[PDB]
Amino acid sequence: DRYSFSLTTFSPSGKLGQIDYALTAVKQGVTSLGIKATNGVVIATEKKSSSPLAMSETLSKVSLLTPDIGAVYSGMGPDYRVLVDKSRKVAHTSYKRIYGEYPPTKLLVSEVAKIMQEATQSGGVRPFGVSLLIAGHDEFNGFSLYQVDPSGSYFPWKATAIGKGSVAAKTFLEKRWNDELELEDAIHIALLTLKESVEGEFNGDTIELAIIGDENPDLLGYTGIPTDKGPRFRKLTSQEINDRLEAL
Amino acid sequence: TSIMAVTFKDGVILGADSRTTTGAYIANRVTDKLTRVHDKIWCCRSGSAADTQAIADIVQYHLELYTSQYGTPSTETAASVFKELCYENKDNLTAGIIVAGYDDKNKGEVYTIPLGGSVHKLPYAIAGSGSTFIYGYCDKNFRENMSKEETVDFIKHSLSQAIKWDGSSGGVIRMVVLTAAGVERLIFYPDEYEQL
Amino acid sequence: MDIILGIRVQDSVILASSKAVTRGISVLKDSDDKTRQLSPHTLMSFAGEAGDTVQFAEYIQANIQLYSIREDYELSPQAVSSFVRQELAKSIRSRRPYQVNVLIGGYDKKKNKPELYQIDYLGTKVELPYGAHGYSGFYTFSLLDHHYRPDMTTEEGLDLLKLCVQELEKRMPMDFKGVIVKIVDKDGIRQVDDF
Amino acid sequence: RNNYDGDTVTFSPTGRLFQVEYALEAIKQGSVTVGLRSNTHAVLVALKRNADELSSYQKKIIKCDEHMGLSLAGLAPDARVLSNYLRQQCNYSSLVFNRKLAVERAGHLLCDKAQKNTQSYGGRPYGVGLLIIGYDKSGAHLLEFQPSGNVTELYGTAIGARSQGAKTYLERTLDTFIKIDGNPDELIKAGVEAISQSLRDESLTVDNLSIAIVGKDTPFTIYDGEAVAKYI
Amino acid sequence: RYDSRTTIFSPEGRLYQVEYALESISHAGTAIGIMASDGIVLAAERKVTSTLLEQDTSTEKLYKLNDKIAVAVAGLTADAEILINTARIHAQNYLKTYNEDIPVEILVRRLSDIKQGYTQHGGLRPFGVSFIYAGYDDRYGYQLYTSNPSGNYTGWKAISVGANTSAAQTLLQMDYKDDMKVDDAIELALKTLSKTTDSSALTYDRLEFATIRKGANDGEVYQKIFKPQEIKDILVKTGIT
Amino acid sequence: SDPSSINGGIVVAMTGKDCVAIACDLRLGSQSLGVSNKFEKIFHYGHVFLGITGLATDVTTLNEMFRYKTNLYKLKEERAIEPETFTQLVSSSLYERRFGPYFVGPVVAGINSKSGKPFIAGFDLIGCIDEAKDFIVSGTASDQLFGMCESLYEPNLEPEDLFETISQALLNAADRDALSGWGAVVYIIKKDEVVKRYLKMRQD
Amino acid sequence: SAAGYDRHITIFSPEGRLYQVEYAFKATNQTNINSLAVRGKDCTVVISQKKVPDKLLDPTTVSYIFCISRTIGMVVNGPIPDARNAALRAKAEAAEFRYKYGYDMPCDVLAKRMANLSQIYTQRAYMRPLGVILTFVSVDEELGPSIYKTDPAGYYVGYKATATGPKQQEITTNLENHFKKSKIDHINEESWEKVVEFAITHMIDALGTEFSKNDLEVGVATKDKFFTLSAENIEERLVAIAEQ
Amino acid sequence: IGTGYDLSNSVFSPDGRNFQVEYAVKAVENGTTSIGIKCNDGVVFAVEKLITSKLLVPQKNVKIQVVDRHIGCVYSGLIPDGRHLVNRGREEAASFKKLYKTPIPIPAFADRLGQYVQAHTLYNSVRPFGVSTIFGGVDKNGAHLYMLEPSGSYWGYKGAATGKGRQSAKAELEKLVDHHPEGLSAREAVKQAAKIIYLAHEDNKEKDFELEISWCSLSETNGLHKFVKGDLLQEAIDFAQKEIN
Amino acid sequence: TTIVGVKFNNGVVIAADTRSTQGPIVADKNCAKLHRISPKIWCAGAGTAADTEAVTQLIGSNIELHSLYTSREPRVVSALQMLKQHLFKYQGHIGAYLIVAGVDPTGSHLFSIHAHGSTDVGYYLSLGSGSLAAMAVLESHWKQDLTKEEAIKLASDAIQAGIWNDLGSGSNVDVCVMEIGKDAEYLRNYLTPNVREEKQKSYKFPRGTTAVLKESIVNICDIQEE
């Protein structure tokens, strides 16, 4: 009641009403999920066209924050875009002068968290409508995956999911997850889990699935340097998703 | 280096020398000194390349915004805009601008803004450190309301004389003819111009 | 003009400071206090630039007293000496300077050793048991260390200091109008007369 | 409803605000003053109030300038902020332009200042009426300033408690005092008659009269005691 | 009701807001720091868990703020992040300024002023967090304190916060041996953690632990957050596993 | 010239083969007056060693400055700061002030643990990337040392070979400089072992 | 529900959403205007209705197609106050962008920065969302013909073609049939004039209502330019349809 | 009503309007009739300033106020509130003159005034405006007539009207489209303006009025705005009285 | 240092020597002097070394955001136009003297920048200390319309000629070719005119030829507690 007409006071059972509503706002979104393996990380989402005429191919819901780190969301569409904007800016500032190349995954998550936290702090501000997943790859902690909550807390995970179909996806991932998976194997889990959510439209035109694995000097835009590391992030096209989607 | 614009009966023809000089060394001999700020209105740059390049850019975005909100700009309008930048930064910046444009309602216009600036209407203006020599030439041999061809030939001979008495004038003589036939650049080789 | 002297003996730190203050061609008084106690067991002698010594001395004294009082136990000579140095290091990068050289001679109770530090006008904290600044250190870097016996007592250091002073008057055209010698020990801080 | 009895930033269904309306109330509980003017003079006559007979009575005339001046009827706190402002503008005109500020021109500055507080949600809105006199290049003028900010040029007007009888004196005798010019004596007497009728269950006394006069020949002067027991 | 701004007071002469922050602790995990002369242990319990949760290569309720002082968390985690970062910044100011490590009493004291400041000033929340501070300074040796969500500190030799504080406290003070040992701290903590927690078999992936010692590798203080397999060793001694 | 020239002092770091040496003099002087015969110019944040030359204030002040930033880096990420990454940092941090620029010439040296490769880097007042796999020398006797180190360097050396090369280098170059010398100390980072060998040399 | 919720955009509902933003998606029915944007192969077309309902209003002051900058048109649907506010910021930012970055501001990038702008108005309770729908049309130099629609929420998504208004649906369904059967997302003809004929025909069937020259206003975006058509030019295209 | 929706200006109704903006329009209605008539060579503005008592001084209180020397504006609704929009308007006018060394075009002014009204609805701590403003003049493109709503909506007009007696005015304006498809020439429109306000004063009848007319005309006021006063105004008065009878 | 940028009808190639000269002392024999703005925009520095390095990272980050925003290959006008307004503000108090070269889907472009900054749009340019040396080669060995192989022989000659005549240049020539819509192939050590002369003597000694007052052992590896 008054514990989300105001942000000052709390429920006597803990937490603001605003946070529990912010999670409701997450589930009203598309379904996004990530699975970590020991030689890769898959990140996968669906995109609701929401008009036969809408082009969701022109805006994808998998967006590189920096070349080695992509992110997805589940939750409100407008809220995602500004939040992504601030991710690209802070990243250069915070570590592309400290290390002169793009940050650790781990670092950018602690930064993002402070921003989400500050909108839970005071009245006359609202939480963000999303929970994000940030996946990336660095050499200092290896492959990682994270879930970043609009409460202002963040949790690392091996595989997790969020969105409308989260509760179905989570039990599914528990069963099929093993101690060593391949990148290819984790893509083959990722398609099945998301297909539980939406069926009767599943194709790689409507489902976007992409990976964080090894460097691409092909998406780097240069070669001829013995130390160069191209984007750990990589987009599969519509055609490549179909090759994996047949493989099931 | 020398710049001029002379009105005629159907337009305005900008004339300028292309050599840009830092000390006695020529930086580049093909700098375009005639720079678009708007569709029908262009400015001439003389003096310091750096100061005149920056002051044109500021005015360029401003006159774009003027066209969208406040309707089509005039040469008159443009010239004042350059005045405000020139007056406050009369000690920071040294900016020579001849502000030439074409209206279908006011024909070609030539306005000249000193270093300090001030908006002054002239049948022709001439500015720079190569302008000093060619003044007397252009004073006598200004015919008013002369043909398109007569303008281009006049300018060509005047600037030839500027090149003979300054080595920072020279290169190719570039021209922007703002008329109702479009935007036509012209270029004149030293082979053509010097015999003349 | 304006000298500050320092010797570390193995049970006390002995700071000396001139009683003379000259503004213009005029000696204003032949008795001038030019050393202040930061806390009851740590003493700052100070010398330096015209009237900066006064503003800076009272500013530094007040801060150390606040932190001693705040903690509810007086801070080490080690804590004290970085702080003073850090004020100076900010000031030369600020739009207003203070250029005041100082010595901190405390008795450290924390580990039981006397501690003489040399803090520069520049703002450089270095530990030295014979430190000295301005034009004093041109004569007493060498005088202290020639006669210096590797162990020392309060008795030994005082006769050697008196001697140092006796050289300075002779080879500078200056007048220090003697020097007051305040002795920093485990029993607090005291004034004792000297040449 | 009267959900608008709290909001000064939110229109009431009538198109008013209630706050502006209550501000007119404040004037009614306020102390009476009668204005009137002619081409060559303008006069303010105001009633001093007291709470007892050991009170030495409230100044109802504030000298704004030596040629302009005002009187009040309503909130004295609000009257102070606007008096400060008003002197600041008249001195400004004498400093920069060596100029007298016109009665009418002053009034348009005060207008923006009322409506600023209406627009805002911060600080009190006004609740005092000022009767303003001056004598400029365009002769004597009389404005009625309202706490709304509406400024009205009349030949005579009144604000304060029981001010509807001053308007009735003034209406009848409207023309008598247009014809009188150059006689300060006559114009002063006319306000005094005026404010006897205005009042009810009261009588005038010597030290209840404060008459403030400026014209073309008369400097800005305030008459008290023996200088106003000649027109009672 | 009083709920609108923190610039008000309830009739107990406190604020209802402070009570609401109090309650935030008692729906989070349980936290225990036991001090001994020979080292201080910090312990926290995880309030989420899964088998696809990464918690074997990470901690989340244990931060070192400098290499001589560590903290445990009980409360919401969203509240925690902001104030940890500020305590750590204050430590490195101390290090920069005085050329030495901060005292325990100040570092906590600052943090306590800051919590109270959000009560004192504005309509901004109180931050419902209780932190256990286990530190070293060469003035009062080992020091164990905790900080209130109201924003005051009180010294200790053992304390529990989190969920079921009362239940935990009686159990800790019963088995407190008066010289104490770091090995007994470590042993006591697991036992006490078990009974509050709603699992009957406490486990190392469900555990966060740091032990602080200067009593071995003397003349210097070394603080160690334990690795998962070591936590397993100490569990086997208490007979839980 | 600059203030860096008035106070002086030298820090020289060098590379051999899976090793580094970074060594310094013990002279601090403030102009003509010699101040300390024992102020070490070598400091460290983990395995990364920071030398500092220049004015005496900035030797102490910047040390506090870079300590502050490496301590937040260390705690958050739970690893040691790397010499590869510290070179980035030194150059931006000094560049923060440009209108009050710090008057120093640092030397960074360390060995990366994520490959074991040896790293040395050179800087000036506001610092720039200067990459070497040979040597970086700094100070008022830097012009002497640049040649002295090149002359004695033989590419590809043992941890024990590298001692000899940096010692003979420092020994004569410091001595035949006004504002340098007065003792020296040599740190040989073998890989992760650091042995400290004090040079017996004269008092300058 | 209602207990705070609808009265704010900084108070979430039990659904996690904002009722108040969603009520502006019901503000396009009040002005009663419809748009149609279609892309040809080299062009983009926008046609919106023009409402002159009184003889005390000139046809040339009532327009809803605005020149934002040289190559960029925009159609506005919905209320006249929020129409202006959006228009200003789009002109100020487009002009500013163009010389700062030296690039002609693409359809995606204008639609993007504005959608960002609309999100910022919603997070603070001091500001409010825009009510209008802006459908930006440009022929880009990096993507050729494009339509990006930005919603009063701060959603923006691309479209083959898009429609807006109270009778928006009926046009949508007509465009669905057209692109689906042909298996191309463009109007096949290459001349911008003949594309405008096709687009005018789809609308007259779909709404059921024949239009006039002073019941349309048409902007046509071509390769690096925009221009808005006058009524007699629009008439020429209308009668093009009427007599084969 | 309740449930927001008028209780703040940020909050929006499910209908597509704002009921707080509707009460502001009611305040324009309550105010005294103003008309503006566009012409093929000028603009004429007229206003009804009613006389409530004869204590007022005639030709001294008006709602006609000038901006530069060639843009006339006249306001209805809350009297000091219309003054203020003109006072800020005047500030906006000056800025443009200084920077571009040119007189302001009327559609340029038209953009700039409506941005002030709109700013006063984006904030719950700023009360909107509650005034309509008839405006126009002669510029580069000739004569133009506009009117601005307290919504923050504006459009161009051939004949415009606002206030209490606006029901008559609207009708006379329409008779004019038919009578003259040039909207009437500027000279004969000063007389047309007076007659209009007289039929409008039949809706205010219980009281007397004072009529002020001003104009700005291309070559019959010479590009400049000046007040219609003198023998000019009295001729306008005589025409009105005659044809009403 | 000789810097040359040479446009051609398939791309651009920019080249420079690898040798850092700060005053009369050679600062580094090899160093990368090609600075990255963006992955197809490479540029080389003149004037102050610290200032050209420092600026290219800040700017280049803003062009990188813009490269994601537009979802396109990065544009040279955007890079140049940001340097051009930026350098102006401090009025030469921070200088940076650069040949900017890059490629775009609108074509290939070539620029120069000053301390204050102004545009110069060339077909072939050279800047730095070795501007006067390079120029005569670029002018006179120039054919109307160049291709890839041609553009680089003219460019390399100009560096090798300025290696002879200038003494601010020398060592190995580092090269970067950027061809429109095709990867940027970085050819470091393309042309090596650097000959070398070896020492005639050894300079390594057995220990005890240096003297050791005392030794000490410091750690850089942390302690345990177990």
CSV table of N, CA, C and O in Angstrom, one decimal, chain E residues 165-204:
chain,number,residue,atom,x,y,z
E,165,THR,N,18.6,-13.7,15.8
E,165,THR,CA,19.6,-13.1,16.6
E,165,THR,C,19.6,-13.5,18.0
E,165,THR,O,20.5,-13.9,18.6
E,166,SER,N,18.4,-13.5,18.6
E,166,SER,CA,18.2,-13.9,20.0
E,166,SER,C,18.5,-15.4,20.3
E,166,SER,O,19.1,-15.7,21.3
E,167,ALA,N,18.1,-16.3,19.5
E,167,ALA,CA,18.3,-17.7,19.5
E,167,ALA,C,19.7,-18.0,19.4
E,167,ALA,O,20.2,-18.8,20.1
E,168,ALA,N,20.4,-17.3,18.4
E,168,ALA,CA,21.9,-17.4,18.1
E,168,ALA,C,22.7,-16.9,19.2
E,168,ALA,O,23.8,-17.5,19.4
E,169,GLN,N,22.3,-15.8,19.9
E,169,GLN,CA,23.1,-15.0,20.8
E,169,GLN,C,23.2,-15.9,22.0
E,169,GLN,O,24.3,-16.0,22.6
E,170,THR,N,22.1,-16.6,22.5
E,170,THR,CA,22.1,-17.3,23.8
E,170,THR,C,23.1,-18.4,23.6
E,170,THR,O,23.9,-18.7,24.6
E,171,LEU,N,23.0,-19.1,22.5
E,171,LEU,CA,23.9,-20.2,22.1
E,171,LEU,C,25.4,-19.8,22.0
E,171,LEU,O,26.2,-20.6,22.5
E,172,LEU,N,25.8,-18.6,21.5
E,172,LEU,CA,27.1,-18.1,21.4
E,172,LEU,C,27.7,-17.8,22.7
E,172,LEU,O,28.9,-18.0,22.9
E,173,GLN,N,26.9,-17.2,23.7
E,173,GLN,CA,27.5,-16.7,24.9
E,173,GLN,C,27.7,-17.8,25.9
E,173,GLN,O,28.5,-17.7,26.9
E,174,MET,N,26.9,-18.9,25.7
E,174,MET,CA,27.0,-20.2,26.5
E,174,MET,C,28.4,-20.9,26.3
E,174,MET,O,29.0,-21.3,27.2
E,175,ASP,N,28.7,-20.9,25.0
E,175,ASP,CA,29.9,-21.8,24.7
E,175,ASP,C,31.1,-20.9,24.5
E,175,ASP,O,32.2,-21.4,24.0
E,176,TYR,N,31.2,-19.7,25.1
E,176,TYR,CA,32.3,-18.8,24.9
E,176,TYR,C,33.3,-19.0,26.0
E,176,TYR,O,33.0,-18.9,27.2
E,177,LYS,N,34.5,-19.5,25.6
E,177,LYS,CA,35.6,-19.9,26.4
E,177,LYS,C,36.4,-18.5,26.4
E,177,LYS,O,36.4,-17.8,25.5
E,178,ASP,N,37.0,-18.2,27.6
E,178,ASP,CA,37.3,-16.9,28.1
E,178,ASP,C,38.6,-16.4,27.4
E,178,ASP,O,38.7,-15.2,27.1
E,179,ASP,N,39.7,-17.2,27.3
E,179,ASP,CA,40.8,-16.9,26.5
E,179,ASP,C,40.4,-16.9,25.0
E,179,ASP,O,40.8,-16.0,24.3
E,180,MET,N,39.7,-17.9,24.6
E,180,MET,CA,39.2,-18.2,23.3
E,180,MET,C,40.4,-18.6,22.4
E,180,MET,O,41.5,-18.3,22.7
E,181,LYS,N,40.0,-19.2,21.2
E,181,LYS,CA,41.0,-19.5,20.1
E,181,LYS,C,40.3,-19.3,18.8
E,181,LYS,O,39.1,-19.4,18.7
E,182,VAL,N,41.0,-18.9,17.8
E,182,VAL,CA,40.6,-18.7,16.4
E,182,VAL,C,40.1,-20.1,16.0
E,182,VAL,O,39.1,-20.2,15.2
E,183,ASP,N,40.8,-21.2,16.3
E,183,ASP,CA,40.3,-22.6,15.9
E,183,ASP,C,38.9,-22.9,16.6
E,183,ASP,O,38.1,-23.4,15.8
E,184,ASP,N,38.6,-22.4,17.8
E,184,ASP,CA,37.3,-22.6,18.5
E,184,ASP,C,36.3,-21.6,17.9
E,184,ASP,O,35.1,-22.0,17.9
E,185,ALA,N,36.7,-20.5,17.4
E,185,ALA,CA,35.8,-19.5,16.7
E,185,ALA,C,35.2,-20.2,15.6
E,185,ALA,O,34.0,-20.0,15.2
E,186,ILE,N,36.1,-20.8,14.8
E,186,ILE,CA,35.8,-21.4,13.5
E,186,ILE,C,34.8,-22.6,13.8
E,186,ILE,O,33.8,-22.7,13.2
E,187,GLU,N,35.1,-23.4,14.9
E,187,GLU,CA,34.3,-24.5,15.3
E,187,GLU,C,33.0,-24.2,15.8
E,187,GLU,O,32.1,-25.0,15.6
E,188,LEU,N,32.8,-23.1,16.6
E,188,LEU,CA,31.6,-22.5,17.2
E,188,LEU,C,30.7,-21.9,16.2
E,188,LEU,O,29.5,-22.1,16.4
E,189,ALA,N,31.2,-21.2,15.2
E,189,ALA,CA,30.5,-20.6,14.2
E,189,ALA,C,29.7,-21.6,13.4
E,189,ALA,O,28.5,-21.4,13.1
E,190,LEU,N,30.3,-22.8,13.0
E,190,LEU,CA,29.6,-23.7,12.1
E,190,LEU,C,28.4,-24.2,12.9
E,190,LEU,O,27.4,-24.4,12.3
E,191,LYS,N,28.6,-24.6,14.1
E,191,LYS,CA,27.6,-25.2,15.1
E,191,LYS,C,26.4,-24.3,15.2
E,191,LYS,O,25.2,-24.8,15.2
E,192,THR,N,26.7,-23.0,15.4
E,192,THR,CA,25.6,-22.0,15.7
E,192,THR,C,24.9,-21.8,14.4
E,192,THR,O,23.7,-21.6,14.3
E,193,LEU,N,25.6,-21.7,13.2
E,193,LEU,CA,25.0,-21.4,11.9
E,193,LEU,C,24.0,-22.4,11.6
E,193,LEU,O,23.1,-22.1,10.8
E,194,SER,N,24.2,-23.7,12.1
E,194,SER,CA,23.4,-24.9,11.7
E,194,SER,C,22.0,-24.9,12.1
E,194,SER,O,21.1,-25.1,11.3
E,195,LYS,N,21.9,-24.5,13.4
E,195,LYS,CA,20.6,-24.6,14.1
E,195,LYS,C,19.7,-23.5,13.6
E,195,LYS,O,18.5,-23.8,13.5
E,196,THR,N,20.1,-22.2,13.3
E,196,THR,CA,19.3,-21.2,12.8
E,196,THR,C,18.8,-21.4,11.4
E,196,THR,O,17.6,-21.2,11.1
E,197,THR,N,19.7,-22.0,10.5
E,197,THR,CA,19.5,-22.3,9.1
E,197,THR,C,18.5,-23.4,9.1
E,197,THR,O,18.4,-24.1,10.0
E,198,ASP,N,17.8,-23.4,8.0
E,198,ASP,CA,16.6,-24.3,7.8
E,198,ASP,C,16.9,-25.6,7.1
E,198,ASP,O,16.0,-26.4,6.9
E,199,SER,N,18.2,-25.8,6.8
E,199,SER,CA,18.8,-27.0,6.4
E,199,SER,C,19.3,-27.7,7.5
E,199,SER,O,19.7,-27.0,8.5
E,200,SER,N,19.4,-29.0,7.4
E,200,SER,CA,19.8,-29.8,8.6
E,200,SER,C,21.2,-30.2,8.3
E,200,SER,O,21.9,-30.7,9.2
E,201,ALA,N,21.7,-30.1,7.1
E,201,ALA,CA,23.1,-30.5,6.7
E,201,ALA,C,23.6,-29.2,6.2
E,201,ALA,O,23.3,-28.9,5.0
E,202,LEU,N,24.4,-28.4,6.9
E,202,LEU,CA,25.1,-27.2,6.4
E,202,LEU,C,26.3,-27.6,5.6
E,202,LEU,O,26.9,-28.6,5.8
E,203,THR,N,26.5,-26.8,4.5
E,203,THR,CA,27.4,-27.2,3.5
E,203,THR,C,28.2,-26.0,3.1
E,203,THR,O,27.8,-24.9,3.4
E,204,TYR,N,29.4,-26.2,2.5
E,204,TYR,CA,30.4,-25.2,2.2
E,204,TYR,C,30.2,-24.3,1.0
E,204,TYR,O,30.5,-23.1,1.0
